[PDB]
Design a protein around this ligand. Structure first.
Ligand SMILES: Nc1ncnc2c1ncn2[C@@H]1O[C@H](COP(=O)(O)OP(=O)(O)OP(O)(O)=S)[C@@H](O)[C@H]1O
Ligand SMILES: Nc1ncnc2c1ncn2[C@@H]1O[C@H](COP(=O)(O)OP(=O)(O)OP(O)(O)=S)[C@@H](O)[C@H]1O
Ligand SMILES: [Mg+2]
Ligand SMILES: [Mg+2]
Lengths: 333, 223
DNA sequence: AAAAAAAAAA
DNA sequence: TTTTTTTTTTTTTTTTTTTTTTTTTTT
């Protein structure tokens, strides 16, 4: 009797809103398919597990930060390569002015189809991101260093001139304008950030990140990447041992971590992960320094076991299939 | 929280602002009330909302393009008389139309603060007539040219501080561990403004990832 | 521990 | 006793509204 007048009043209000602002302006959450979380691969199997939903979320903002030579650029080029292989279009905003296109090709990027810009100002860089997002035609945008997004007033000015929170104000304005446009287009925006040290502190972490506080709030994922050691061929240093921590996650549980190798000129060692994961799920038996699959003794030392998996593609596919089915919280197939 | 009033919840990044606000909705829906979520941040996960106990099928949701559209939907739902709880996720993301049409770097002096001042004037009366609760989530920013007091401020100007009946400061004060596995957050809420009872009291509880607020954990500490 | 500049409406 | 005719001209203001954002070691 009284709850029936409410239903009518609600129906009228929903009608008026949808008439004034458009069709999908207000709906019930359960019947809105645009609100479902869709993910793409990072190129690392251990990081796809650490993220919980099987990769990085489309339509959202992501931040990757870390110290010098930690693998930030290499990780983003592996995301682009994985996305291009699924027929997605990708752009790269090189504000650092330090991208090598031969190295990009070696990591598996299609150089001929990758859009690239080397913008003069931070405002120009963030206006190009906004235009590509509104277009609806780009799936992945990478912005190499927030740290190098210089405001126009600071470029026109002199070295020593104070610009009080001008960069922080530009980023705060950029997040507001972009967040909505990225969601509508289903575009993934990745920001790379550098670490700076903060003075006037004794407690907590003195490590900070550049460009103000806005990006910490709007990011759906935040990744801290670090070099933890060297990969050696006796004498020759051939790569880096790498750790990634998930320090913020809005699509699954945070504070999981991933370990993997970056080999110079190849990128992320996929088979090296697949060994360590296959061992952890009891699909590979480790008898001291010997690796064995189903009784068959495959190698001794991780490098020989990795080389064995390389020259036998089918048995590697079998182990991948199992690890994928088992450890992923949300398998998508 | 009082019906027919405005409430503000603010805090740092990943402090539990959205989680707390979905637990209010879940509790209200179990008493037959109708609820709406205005997601200006464009970052609500509907499967997480379901895990916290929200009825996803009956929750009204809107992802609006401008701050003006967001606040016009709040006024329309308030006048209707049929919605009991409205949540607006970040004031910080309530972008004025002129700023969306403009270019990055363009100045818009106190335009967002002016929109918020206008919205409070229009909403306060309508919410009281409908008996509708409006919750604003806010983000923290640093102020410059300060040695006194707190350099922390909130977004969107000064109007919201005056019109709010309750203001809540939420903070993550530690990890909940199962040996090695981090399984949740230790959380503190301070009541920094109260017009319906005495202010400056505080609350401590756990948020467990995938469950929400640990009720039985509180019942132990109170018992 | 010391710093700066930004408009449009009946 | 008999029988109407025809427009002319302006006058004078009232009143504000609202913040936004960090930056960096040094030995
Ligand atoms: N063209 C290249 N050839 C061989 N090795 C490279 C090349 N470019 C980078 N590397 C190596 O790969 C590792 C990761 O490098 P990056 O991915 O550039 O790390 P990064 O964090 O982006 O570092 P920055 O931008 O210089 S602070 C480092 O050990 C580099 O020396
Ligand atoms: N879908 C999810 N699955 C698991 N944990 C989550 C999920 N969403 C949020 N959390 C965790 O719950 C805690 C509180 O998260 P929120 O309630 O989203 O905080 P918040 O203050 O709204 O943070 P923002 O909006 O991102 S600055 C954090 O540790 C999150 O990582
Ligand atoms: Mg780099
Ligand atoms: Mg939130």
């Amino acid at each position: 009797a009284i709850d029936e007048n409410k239903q009518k009043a609600l129906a009228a209000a929903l009608g008026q809103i949808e008439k004034q602002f458009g069709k999908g302006s207000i709906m019930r959450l359960g019947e809105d398919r645009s609100m479902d979380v869709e993910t793409i691969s990072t190129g690392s199997l251990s990081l796809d597990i650490a993220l919980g939903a099987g990769g990085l979320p489309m339509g959202r903002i992501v931040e990757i930060y870390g110290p010098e030579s930690s693998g930030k650029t290499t990780l983003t080029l592996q995301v682009i390569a994985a996305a291009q292989r699924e027929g997605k279009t990708c752009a790269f905003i090189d504000a650092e002015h330090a991208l090598d296109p031969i190295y990009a090709r070696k990591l598996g990027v299609d150089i001929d189809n990758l859009l690239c810009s080397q913008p003069d100002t931070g405002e120009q860089a963030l206006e190009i991101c906004d235009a590509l997002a509104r277009s609806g035609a780009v799936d992945v945008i990478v912005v190499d260093s927030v740290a190098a997004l210089t405001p126009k007033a600071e470029i026109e000015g002199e070295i020593g001139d104070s610009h009080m929170g001008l960069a922080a104000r530009m980023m705060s304005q950029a997040m507001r304008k972009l967040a909505g446009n990225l969601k509508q287009s289903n575009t993934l925006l990745i920001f790379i950030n550098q670490i700076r040290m903060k003075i006037g502190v004794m407690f907590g972490n003195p490590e900070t990140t550049t460009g103000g506080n806005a990006l910490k709030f709007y990011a759906s994922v935040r990744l801290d990447i670090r070099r933890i050691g060297a990969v050696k061929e006796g004498e020759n240093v051939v790569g880096s041992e790498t750790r990634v921590k998930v320090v913020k996650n809005k699509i699954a549980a945070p504070f999981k971590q991933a370990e993997f190798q970056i080999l110079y000129g190849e990128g992320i060692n996929f088979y090296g992960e697949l060994v360590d994961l296959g061992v952890k799920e009891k699909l590979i038996e480790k008898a001291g320094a010997w690796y064995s699959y189903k009784g068959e003794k495959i190698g001794q030392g991780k490098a020989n076991a990795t080389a064995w998996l390389k020259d036998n593609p089918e048995t590697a596919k079998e182990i991948e299939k199992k690890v994928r089915e088992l450890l992923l919280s949300n398998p998508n197939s």
